Amino acid sequence: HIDSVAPGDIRYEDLRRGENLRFVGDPEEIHLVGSAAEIEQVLSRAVRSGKRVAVRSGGHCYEDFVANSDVRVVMDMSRLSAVGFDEERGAFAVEAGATLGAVYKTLFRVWGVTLPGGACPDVGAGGHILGGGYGPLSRMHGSIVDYLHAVEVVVVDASGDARTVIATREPSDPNHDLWWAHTGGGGGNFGVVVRYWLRTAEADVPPEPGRLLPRPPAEVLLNTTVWPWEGLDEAAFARLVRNHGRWFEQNSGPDSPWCDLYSVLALTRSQSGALAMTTQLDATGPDAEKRLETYLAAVSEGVGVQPHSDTRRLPWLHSTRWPGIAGDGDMTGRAKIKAAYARRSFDDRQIGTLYTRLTSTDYDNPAGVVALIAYGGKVNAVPADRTAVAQRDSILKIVYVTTWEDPAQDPVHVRWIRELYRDVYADTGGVPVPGGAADGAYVNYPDVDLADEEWNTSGVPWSELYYKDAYPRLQAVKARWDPRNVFRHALSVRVPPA
Amino acid sequence: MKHIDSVAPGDIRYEDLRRGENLRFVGDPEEIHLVGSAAEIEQVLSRAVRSGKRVAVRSGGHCYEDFVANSDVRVVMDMSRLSAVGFDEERGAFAVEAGATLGAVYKTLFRVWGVTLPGGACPDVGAGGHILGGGYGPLSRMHGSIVDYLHAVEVVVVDASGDARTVIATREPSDPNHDLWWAHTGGGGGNFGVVVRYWLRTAEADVPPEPGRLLPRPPAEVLLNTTVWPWEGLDEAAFARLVRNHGRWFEQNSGPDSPWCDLYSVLALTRSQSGALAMTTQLDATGPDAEKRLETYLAAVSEGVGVQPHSDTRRLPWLHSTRWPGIAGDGDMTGRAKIKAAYARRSFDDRQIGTLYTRLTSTDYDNPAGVVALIAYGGKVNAVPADRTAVAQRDSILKIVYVTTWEDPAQDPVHVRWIRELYRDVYADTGGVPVPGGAADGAYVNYPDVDLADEEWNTSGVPWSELYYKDAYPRLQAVKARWDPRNVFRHALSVRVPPA
Ligand SMILES: *Cc1cc2c(nc3c(=O)[nH]c(=O)nc-3n2C[C@H](O)[C@H](O)[C@H](O)COP(=O)(O)OP(=O)(O)OC[C@H]2O[C@@H](n3cnc4c(N)ncnc43)[C@H](O)[C@@H]2O)c(*)c1C
Ligand SMILES: *Cc1cc2c(nc3c(=O)[nH]c(=O)nc-3n2C[C@H](O)[C@H](O)[C@H](O)COP(=O)(O)OP(=O)(O)OC[C@H]2O[C@@H](n3cnc4c(N)ncnc43)[C@H](O)[C@@H]2O)c(*)c1C
Ligand SMILES: [Cl-]
Ligand SMILES: [Cl-]
Ligand SMILES: [Mg+2]
Ligand SMILES: [Mg+2]
């Protein structure tokens, strides 16, 4: 229970931002909240005053949802970073301010378990878990939301009063639909998550903590494969994308033996000098090294460029902080990200578009990338309607990103990535319309352009791209638990016009 | 704060937990205990002492030598559960548990109280093995050594009877355990007992008992510069002028009263195979002429060198700046490395600069990853008398790191020999080591190098102990005799009592 941070405080330049430096907030106060009770009193005071609020956990939002200049009061979750096992509830409690790196280190070193969350260690649990997401173990263990047993959330009723509710996976729980909205609803929509409780949904299980969350593979093979751009012509490039697409089309079923494989294929600007792929395979099973080889051979088969390939073997927890998996921890640039689900691999026109845009000399930036992220496996064993992650038959997530340094150049980079993504999706109004080759987009990589009639000409609204048929049930949760629409932003769940 | 099962061979965690972060060393411990409390640590030590089993503690795992992962160690106490950071109102000081990483310490101290500690720049280093060894970081020149803030330490020690007990030792001179406190202001890890938690606060007398005033404030915003000089067409005279410019600058601008106490930089003298020499610089941005002052430093380093540097400067809020890889490093501990270290009281002489040029351009070696890094130091570190803590080096201007990195264990001999011969040749005038009290001032124990205790590599007649501790060593030996009389806590560079 401590002083809030206001302009003039030594901490204000840090705390008025998240990790995305494109967005600089102007809040009057940032509250380092310490408990559900404190969050109730901050929210109720702000609601009484008519002041716009937002929550910051890990600060990784790709859009201006927290740092929007309209936000007056931020609740920053940094003090709430506990991770542990709640004996009373029989589940792991992860408070919203815990980073994923701290979650994986504690769960694994202490109990030998993990969650199939994201790969960046500094991401906050608070804005990540409730939006679903992907990570290296999604194929092996399913989505992180498949582990959400309960959620503690501070909500604001019609009167303006704040209160804390615990909502659970039990369907007769009066707050069951509020728990369901936290299985992929996304941050900044329903209320302030204080903590999540995570546990397997299996009925079998003795209630010992080491049995109650999935085990990672004990060691993994990690490969870095790099093809020089100087050696790749369009036909080569196309063959490689096609090989990879076919392989993921064949080998992403929930019963596939390849659920233990994860990879990221980085289709980089040719200006970068090299195309690259990072692969992780469980190293513990019979024939791991040969199986890794047979995946790598498939990707490069008939490409006519010999890739540079190196494989190391690491114990699992050490593996998670290898930069090839974790990324480089550099958030000091400016970036614009876009995203899509792929149900099938890129077609011939799309591959040609990608080739053109990545080799273009009308643009100058080595940092543009289209990353194809191995997906499906056990994520796809879950029926589409079970959680608020409705996309349960995709084979890849696709990330489109460009990064740069100079803010005067924002319009150039933002236009390039917008035109690239619009042209890849040109047959469907510039966007990855669901239930076809694509399956919409995923809310942890929000893109306000999906709501912009200038860029989305498909007639399919942003809410259907992220949530497909889950959206009506999410709107009902919104109407019931945030009737005043306290929690909102450029892509927030909104009730139907009245 | 309950005990849980220990981790033995067969356990899914054993491959991770038998290692620290330096992959050259793989422990063969029988048991790794994820200790939850001091009482638990007492039980594990007691048991190990009775059965004659060798112990070591692992906090953040960043040890550069085999002190924890030595195949002789049978029982490891792993501090991962003890990672709290907070303000302890019982003592009026900030408590940092041994298992907390520096990243977590800086994020908590600064977001919650607006304060910090002038410790190391790598966020994943653990408090446990770091703070008691002293060390350096970006704010050393501004705020002095992290040990200058050590108020008290909770440590589990083993008596001659082999009973284990927990003691709190403080900076209070009348404390019966004062000497044990002192040995934790630089005596280094793995020597006296198991640190459970440290308490930190300013020693200032005229300070109100509020947390936000009890530790130093960082500069609210900093300028951060990357400068790069291409190696192609940088000849020996050019290299030499660069190293000499930088050296003279630090000779003149590293006193405790210097206005340049708010500057930190690291100059990386890289292998020419790498393609570029590089320098990273941080400067407080909040004062009137910060841009211009930064340019003055950069212009001094490049003056008359004749190779135009590529230079880019960004400005960040302080906490964000700490995670910029230019300052924090790259977070990649997956390779193999051998490191060596020295204090510099003066900058490199002409002979040493020539040896550096030869070694870094050599085509008899093949590795672009060799570096000699020159780290800005002194400033407010040198305001403290040499005898006040167990960090005896209080008049140096630079710390120097010699490092080589590689991948294949089959090549260990080759990289190890390269860095040994480089270091020996730079220090050839004094027995291949940085002998204290001269152009050098010994080495610092957070970058331990067991070759300093090897008569094959150290031909100066000055022992490893004097290189690390100078005249603090006798008082360290008294503390060792008093609090670890059985010599439970030991390794290749551990404090040892005199021969009997
Ligand atoms: C920067 C970054 C993001 C990544 C990275 N890797 C990912 C990966 O491997 N898989 C993924 O699925 N996602 C990855 N992401 C994206 C992140 O998952 C998203 O950026 C998350 O939304 C980030 O969460 P968090 O760090 O907490 O960011 P915030 O900016 O604080 O919040 C985002 C959003 O959610 C709301 N919110 C925060 N906290 C709460 C609580 N407690 N209750 C309700 N709502 C909350 C915010 O207000 C905002 O709306 C890798 C990298 C490097
Ligand atoms: C890998 C790494 C090391 C760095 C980095 N950056 C540094 C910097 O910017 N400034 C520095 O001064 N030092 C830097 N270092 C070096 C680290 O400071 C040292 O490597 C520290 O000794 C690391 O401490 P820790 O991570 O806790 O390492 P451990 O291997 O667990 O222990 C080292 C040593 O100390 C003993 N020990 C650990 N814990 C205890 C306790 N609780 N009580 C007593 N003794 C303890 C161990 O047994 C071992 O002997 C940047 C990078 C990337
Ligand atoms: Cl609470
Ligand atoms: Cl990260
Ligand atoms: Mg970060
Ligand atoms: Mg690390």
Side-chain angles (χ1 to χ4, degrees), chain A residues 2 10-11 13-15 17-19 21 32 78-79 99 105 108-112 122 215-216 218-219 312 314-318 321-323 328-330 332 405, chain B residues 4 12-13 15-17 19-21 23 34 80-81 101 107 110-114 124 217-218 220-221 314 316-320 323-325 330-332 334 407:
Chain A
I2 61 169
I10 193 177
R11 295 163 287 180
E13 292 301 307
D14 282 299
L15 292 181
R17 286 165 168 90
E19 303 296 328
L21 297 180
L32 283 139
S78 304
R79 302 174 52 209
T99 63
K105 178 194 292 180
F108 187 68
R109 290 190 184 157
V110 187
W111 293 280
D122 294 333
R215 290 167 132 230
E219 294 171 74
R312 62 201 56 249
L314 287 171
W316 179 76
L317 184 59
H318 284 77
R321 299 299 278 275
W322 178 57
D328 61 15
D330 185 349
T332 66
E405 291 286 335
Chain B
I4 54 160
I12 180 171
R13 299 164 284 181
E15 291 298 310
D16 282 298
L17 289 180
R19 288 173 171 82
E21 301 299 325
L23 294 184
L34 291 130
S80 291
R81 298 169 65 203
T101 58
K107 179 195 286 183
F110 184 66
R111 296 191 180 157
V112 184
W113 291 287
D124 291 328
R217 290 169 135 238
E221 289 185 80
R314 73 200 54 249
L316 290 175
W318 182 74
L319 179 71
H320 283 75
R323 297 301 282 271
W324 174 63
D330 63 14
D332 189 353
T334 67
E407 287 282 329

Side-chain angles (χ1 to χ4, degrees), chain B residues 274-288 290-354:
Chain B
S274 84
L277 284 177
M279 175 173 75
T280 298
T281 300
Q282 167 176 306
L283 185 66
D284 179 351
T286 63
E291 295 68 25
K292 182 189 167 102
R293 290 175 64 231
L294 174 63
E295 287 303 313
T296 290
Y297 170 71
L298 303 170
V301 176
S302 281
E303 182 67 34
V305 169
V307 172
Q308 180 75 35
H310 182 268
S311 167
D312 83 88
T313 295
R314 73 200 54 249
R315 169 183 191 116
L316 290 175
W318 182 74
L319 179 71
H320 283 75
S321 71
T322 64
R323 297 301 282 271
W324 174 63
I327 285 286
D330 63 14
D332 189 353
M333 293 295 296
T334 67
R336 294 172 79 85
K338 166 71 185 171
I339 209 138
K340 299 184 163 270
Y343 283 99
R345 292 183 73 238
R346 317 197 253 272
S347 66
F348 288 133
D349 71 28
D350 294 347
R351 188 206 118 240
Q352 294 172 309
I353 292 181

